[PDB]
Structure 1
Amino acid sequence: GFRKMAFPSGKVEGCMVQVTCGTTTLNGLWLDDVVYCPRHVICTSEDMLNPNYEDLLIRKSNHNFLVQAGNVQLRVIGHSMQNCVLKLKVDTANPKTPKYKFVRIQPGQTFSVLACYNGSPSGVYQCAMRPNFTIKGSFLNGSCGSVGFNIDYDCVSFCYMHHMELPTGVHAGTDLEGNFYGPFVDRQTAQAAGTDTTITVNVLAWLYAAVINGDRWFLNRFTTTLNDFNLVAMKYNYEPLTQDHVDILGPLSAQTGIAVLDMCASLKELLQNGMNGRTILGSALLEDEFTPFDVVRQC
């Protein structure tokens, strides 16, 4: 079987706390003796339209920030801002801090999201960083400060902290240095993203997964050159396929004995014609949020 699968979230759950300033409550990430959270916690309703964050922050003191780990209040003993993230220093070290790192993820890569409300983990699911630097998440009021991450041999690599929803229903946020993915800004305004394109290497990986699990109706005897495929992909707002993508797809091609460029010819046929009302792995749409690595770690 083949399933969209999130990393086990326990190591991140032990880091989630609630952060409150004024009438605004969201989540923070508590690592060692620092809590990281979105800086817009310091805004009021009036501030959010055009917040001068440095000016709003100079007027705050440590005691204006209320941090709670469950029933326990953590004393804030220091605070600073790094881009769009606030760093609150507390007197307590988190005993549950995992081995971790902060990474900035590349578009087309996937990560797990731990959606939290009031410092309490609520759900976990897989997202991809879109080419237009949005993510198609599930985030409601109070979800800010929820984080996205990957796990590699007990090391948690944090890559995303949640800040906002766009009018189209997609989501935007920062890495853990507080820099946004994409052209977005943490102010209460309607923001549009650039035109979103489809992650072609991931669509190919998912077709290979549909073949492994016995689904073949889309394949064909034909083939294509890399450049000719990429001309058709760009026409249909698919990202171009690089030679590294082809290389990355090697293991999957070998396992199924289907040349990458033969799978490209199949995808070309799908783009030009369609599904014909049919489905692949249950879906009526081409799925582009599985990476080659994601697929390999499942067959």
Structure 2
Amino acid sequence: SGFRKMAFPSGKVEGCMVQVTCGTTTLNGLWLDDVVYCPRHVICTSEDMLNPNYEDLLIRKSNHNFLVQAGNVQLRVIGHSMQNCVLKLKVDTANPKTPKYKFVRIQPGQTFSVLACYNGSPSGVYQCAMRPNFTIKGSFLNGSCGSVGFNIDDCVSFCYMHHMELPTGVHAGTDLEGNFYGPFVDRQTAQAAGTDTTITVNVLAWLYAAVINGDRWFLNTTTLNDFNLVAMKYNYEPLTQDHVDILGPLSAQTGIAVLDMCASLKELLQNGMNGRTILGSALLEDEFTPFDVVRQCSGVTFQ
């Protein structure tokens, strides 16, 4: 019993963290096979971050300006290229600890674990959602750049690399091909993350988790259009039939129809929680996918 924000076991990713140094700039890199991946702004000086011309900046750089550390052993860089916003440093040594892995670009509302890292060494692990506005709400300090986000299915699916801490304390970065999530660019100018919304299908998954664990008081019908008319008023993501189908297997195991749970949530939005808690939270939680809930509640393991 119980329900917690659970992160994936992080061992397979710990063995892939390295420390990447270019000039005086030092951040984290990801060492898979004979390639190291890090944010391309590792080549930026103090003044260069304000308006970098990365192509011109990287032309001023040869292989020997890139110093890669893995624990103690230096790696020889024998090739460098830029792919979108990530630098790729080919090294002469395949990582012996390379897990089976894939590169993945997730969708708003999906979750993953971040291994927060400084100087190439793991500091901590926690779970995150890709917000609808393509930011993430995490714990990133200067130096955390290059930490990665991942899911595990024995195969590690890397989905996020950390690139930047914005004003308002929001966080942004790229997939592992270097394509930013959201409108952001790797330039130190003020950058607007637009209006966020609440991940509706996730809140519903979490109410199911609440029922599975004996937390039932909010159980109490409505329609998809009626619910969408309420949800839009409270800045909730609209609920599509696809989302109802993703909640199917929770509906089965819990014996509560998707539409009935929407009725319960509609009531919760219009009246708040009156000081009650759900799963020990005083707010409605939207960073659990339906997959997350079934995973935790059916004890899925990895190796």
Q: Same fold (TM over 0.5)?
A: yes
Displacement of 1:165 after TM fit?
A: 1.2
Question: In the TM superposition, what whole-angstrom CA distance separates every residue of 1:191-230 from its partner, at most 9, and x where no partner exists?
Answer: 220100000000000011111111111111xx01111101
Please give the alpha-carbon distance, in whole angstroms, between the structure 2 residues aligned to 1:15 and 1:45. Answer: 28
TM-score normalised by L of structure 2? 0.96
Distance in 2 (alpha carbons) for counterparts of 1:215 and 1:32: 47
How many residues are paired up? Answer: 296
Dislocated runs of 4+, deviation >6 Å: none
Contact 1:163 1:172 in 2 (8 A): yes
Mapping for residues 1-299 of structure 1, pairs under 5 Å: 1-152=2-153, 154-220=154-220, 223-299=221-297
Q: CA deviation at 1:259?
A: 0.9
Residues 103-132 of structure 1, C-alpha deviation per residue, up to 9 Å, x if partnerless?
Answer: 100111001111110000111111011100
8 A contact 1:106–1:129 mirrored in 2: yes
Distance in 2 between residues matched to 1:217 and 1:99, nearest whole Å: 44
Alpha-carbon distance in structure 1 between the residues aligned to 2:151 and 2:250: 22
- Offset at residue 273 of structure 1 (A): 1.0
TM-score (norm 1): 0.98
What do you get for the CA RMSD once the two structures are aligned?
A: 0.8
Q: Structure 1: how far apart are the matches of 2:212 and 2:8?
A: 23
Structure 2: how far apart are the matches of 1:61 and 1:54?
Answer: 13
CA drift of 1:156 comes to 0.7
Contact 1:197-1:238 within 8 A present in 2 as well: yes
Structure 1's unaligned 5+ residue stretches are none
Shift of 1:190: 2.2
Contact (CA 8 Å) 1:35, 1:87: kept in 2 or not?
A: yes
Deviations 1:71-92 (A, max 9, x none): 1110111100000000001111
| TM-superposition CA deviations, 1:263-283 (whole Å, max 9, x none) | 001110111110112111111
CA contact (8 A) 1:166 1:192 kept: no
Check conservation: 1:167, 1:192, Cα contact below 8 A. no
Whole-Å Cα distance in 2 between the matches of residues 254 and 15 of structure 1?
40
CA distance in 2, matches of 1:297, 1:60: 46
SS at match of 1:216: coil
- Summarize deviations over 1:28-84 as a string: whole Å, max 9, x none: 000110000000000001100000000000010111111000111101111000000
Structure 2 stretches of 5 or more lacking a match?
298-303
CA distance in 1, matches of 2:191, 2:283: 26
